[PDB]
Paper text:
To obtain insight into ternary complex formation with [name] we solved a low resolution hLGR5ecto–mRspo2Fu1-Fu2–mZNRF3ecto complex. This complex is very similar to the equivalent RNF43-containing complex in the overall positioning of the three different types of subunits. The RspoFu1-Fu2 fragment is sandwiched between the two receptor ectodomains which do not contact each other. Thus, a Rspo ligand serves to heterodimerize an LGR receptor with an E3 receptor in both flavours of ternary complex. However, as previously proposed by us the ternary complex involving [name] adopts a clear 2:2:2 stoichiometry in the crystal lattice due to dimerisation of the [name] ectodomain. Compared to the relative position of RNF43 in the ternary complex, each [name] subunit is rotated 30° away from its partner [name]. We note that dimerisation of ZNRF3ecto and consequent 2:2:2 stoichiometry of the ternary complex would not be compatible with the exact arrangement of ligand and receptors as seen in the RNF43 ternary complex due to clashes of the membrane-proximal regions of the two LGR receptors (not shown). This rigid body shift in the position of the [name]/RNF43 relative to LGR also requires a re-orientation of the Rspo2Fu1 domain to maintain the β-hairpin 1 and 2 mediated interface with the E3. It appears that the difference in relative orientation of the LGR and E3 receptors for the RNF3 versus ZNRF43 ternary complex renders this flexibility a necessity for Rspo to function as a cross-linker in both contexts. Our crystallographic [name]–Rspo–[name] complex, albeit at low resolution, confirms the 2:2:2 stoichiometry that we had hypothesised would be favoured for ternary complexes involving [name], as opposed to the 1:1:1 stoichiometry seen for the corresponding RNF43 complex.
Author numbering:
A (entry chain B): 39 to 141
B (entry chain C): 53 to 205
C (entry chain A): 31 to 485, 539 to 543
The structure:
Amino acid sequence: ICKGCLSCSKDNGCSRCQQKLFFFLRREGMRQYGECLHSCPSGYYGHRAPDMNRCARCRIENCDSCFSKDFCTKCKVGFYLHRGRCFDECPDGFAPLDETMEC
Amino acid sequence: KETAFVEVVLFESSPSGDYTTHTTGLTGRFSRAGAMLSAEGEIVQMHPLGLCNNNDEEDLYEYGWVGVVKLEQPELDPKPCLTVLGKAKRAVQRGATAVIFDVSENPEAIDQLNQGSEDPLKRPVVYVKGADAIKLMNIVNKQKVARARIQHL
Amino acid sequence: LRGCPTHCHCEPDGRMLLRVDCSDLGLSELPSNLSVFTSYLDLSMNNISQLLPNPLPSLRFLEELRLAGNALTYIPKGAFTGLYSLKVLMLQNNQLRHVPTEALQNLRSLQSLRLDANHISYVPPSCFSGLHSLRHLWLDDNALTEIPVQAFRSLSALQAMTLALNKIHHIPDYAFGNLSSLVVLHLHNNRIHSLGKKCFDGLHSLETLDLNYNNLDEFPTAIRTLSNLKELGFHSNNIRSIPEKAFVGNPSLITIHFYDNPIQFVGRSAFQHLPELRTLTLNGASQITEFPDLTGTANLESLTLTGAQISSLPQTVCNQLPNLQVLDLSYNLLEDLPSFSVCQKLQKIDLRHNEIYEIKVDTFQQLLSLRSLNLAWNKIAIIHPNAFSTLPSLIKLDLSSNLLSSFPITGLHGLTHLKLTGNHALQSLISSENFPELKVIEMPYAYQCCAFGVCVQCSP
C-alpha cells in the first residue's frame, strides 16, 4: 500500500510525491524505498522548499524530535529540555521539575 | 566485457554463535566504467535520488557496501543531478565496494556507462537484466540482510 | 472491547493513556462516540468539510491533535473548548483563508501550532490571546503580505517561527516587539525588498536568522541589536555591499551565508571580532583593493577570497591567521609574498591567476601539512632551489603558464600531481626517478612526456 505517491513501484516504493507531500527515504536493513508523508517521523524535521520538501535527520545529541537543524523539541529518556538543548543537570537560575522532565 | 558471477548468500545466526547459509546464483556483466575485479560485501540498496551531491550532507554507511540501484524509465527523469556514471562515482565515494545497476527499465545506461572507459573507477561496476534482475529484486524486497559475492572469471 | 472507533487503530501511551490513529480513512465527519483518555489523535487526509455536527469537548487528556490534509474552511469559536492539555496542534495542508478569529484563544497549554501550507493571508489581532505556552509556530507556504506585529505582540513565549515561502515584502521597525524568548526565525523564500533599521530590536534571545532566497537591496543594518546571534543566512539576494562595522554588534557569530549576492565593496573592518567564526568565502568582490583586518578572529580554518584587486599582503598577516588550513587567493593582483611560515596547519593553497614574479626561500618554509599548491597563470620568472625543500606532505603542484626556464628538483620528492604546461622555456627533460608515485602529469612538450614512458598519464 504505497500511499500518497504520484509514481509508485514495488522495488523503490513511492517516488515523486503527490501534491504537497514530503519525500522521505526509509531504510530497513539493506532495502531502501521512498515514502510520501505530510509530517516527518520522530527524529527528523521538515525542510520546505519550492520544489523539494524532505525530512532531514536531527543531529542534536540527546534529541528524539526537533524543530530545525539546531533546536530540539523532545529529548530522550532521562534528559531535561531547556531552550532547545537537552541536559542531564538543570542549569542555575531555575530547578528541575520531574513531572514532564523539563526546567 | 567479461561475465560477472553473482552469489547472493542468505544466512541465519544460530543460537550457538555459528551460522548457516543458502547460496543463490545469478549472472550479469562488468561495465568498463569500473574495474574488472572481484568484490564482496554487505548489500545496501540505494534509491536513485539518494545519490546526489546537491544534498549538503547525507546518511553515513559502513564502508564496503555492495550498492544495488534500480534505474527508472528514461523519460521520467529529464536531467538527473548526476549521470549514471556520476552516481556510481558518488556510491564509491560514499563507501561502495561495488555497484550493481538493474538495467531492465533503461538500456541506454549501458552506452552511457561504457562511454568513460579511459578513466575507470577504483571499484567494479556491474549491470543486470531480465530474469536474473528479477531474482535479485525478489531477495532485496523480502529479506533483511544479505551478502553479495561478485567474481571475475 | 472499549470505545476505539470502528476501522481505526489504537495504542497505549503510558498506562490507561490512549493514542488513536484514524488517518487516511476518508471520514466525512469525525466519529460521534469517542472515548475520553485519548492522549494522541491523528485525523489526516480524511475529506473533512466542517467540525462538527457533534464536536467533542470533555477530552481533557488530549495531548496531540493532528488535523492535516482535511478540507477545513474555518474553525467555529467553541470548537476546542474542552482541551486543556492540548500541547501540539497540527493544521497543515488545509484550505484555511485566515487564522481562526476567536477559536484558538485561551488554549493555556498549547505549545506548538502548525498552520503551514494553507492559503491564509489575514491574521486577526488577539487571535493568539491567552496562549501562555505557545513555543513553536509554523506559518510557511501561506499567502501572508506583512508581519502581523499586532497579533504577535501577545506571543511572548514563542521560541521558534517560520514565515517562509510567503509573499512578505517589508518588515517594519519593532515588528517582533514583545517576542523576548524568540530564538529561531525563518524568513526565507519571501519577497523581502526593504526592512527597517530597528526591525529586529524586540528579540534579544534570537540565535538564528534565515533571510535566504529574498530580494534585499542593501545589507540589513537591523542586525546591529542582535547580540545572541549565532547563525545568519542571507544568500541569493540582490545586496550590493557590506558596510564598515557590519557585525560589530554580533560577537559569537559562528556560521554566515551570503553567496549569490552581487557584492562589490566590503568594509575592511567589517569582519572584526568574530572569534568563533571558522569559515569565510568571498567570490567576485572586485572593489576590494587592500587586505581586510581580522583582529579578534584568529580561528578561521578556511579563507577563500577571489576576483578582487588586492595588491600586497601585510608581513604579519599569519600572526592574525593561525589555525588556518586552506587558502585560495586566486584571480587577484598579488606581487610580493610574506613568509607564510607562521601559518602552520596549512593544507591547501591556490594562488592561480595572480601577478607573482618570484618564489623566494622563506616564503614556503616549514609547512609540514601542506598538500596542494597551485601557482598557475603567474609570471614566475625564477624559483630558488630550496624553496620547496621543507614540504614533506606536498603531493599536488601546478605551475602552468609561468614562463619558467629552469626547474628546482630539490625536495618535493615523491609527489603525485605535477602540471607544467605553458612554461615554454622549460625545455629540459625530467627523469622517472626523483619523482615516484606520479599519477597525473601535464607537460609543455610531448618529448618530455616520452621520458616517463608515454608514447600514469601525461598530456602534451
